[PDB]
Amino acid sequence: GPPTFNPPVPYFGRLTARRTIIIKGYVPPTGKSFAINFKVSGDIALHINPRMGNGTVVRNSLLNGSWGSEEKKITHNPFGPGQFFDLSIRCGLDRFKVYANGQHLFDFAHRLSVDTLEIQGDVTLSYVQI
């Protein structure tokens, strides 16, 4: 499983527990927002949505066109405009564990009972490795 280099945005990659996904990217200086979606079919098990406008990192799940409760709590925000980030997402048995630049960012408990990776919006990708 070699890394994909300079994948285009919007990105659509086809995808298990204890496996970690690497995403290196870049936030454009004029960026407003971007999204990273772990989807089944158009349902989203984990929606990661950094918004540079108010500096939030919004997490949620999408079932039947309906969003669940938002999770927003963080101790740091690695997604400032004009900055590069090194993101890792480990799929655990009961939750996602997401790190940014080696520092834990958040955990996300599985709500959905995930074979697709979607990345769209104001972001440039350096490489994605599964």
Ligand SMILES: OC[C@H]1O[C@@H](O[C@H]2[C@H](O)[C@@H](O)[C@H](O)O[C@@H]2CO)[C@H](O)[C@@H](O)[C@H]1O
């Ligand atoms: O929850 C993820 C979801 O949020 C939508 O926007 C929300 C917004 O976060 C919230 O503050 C407001 O009360 O309702 C909005 C729904 O219209 C985004 O539109 C969507 O892309 C997701 O990111």
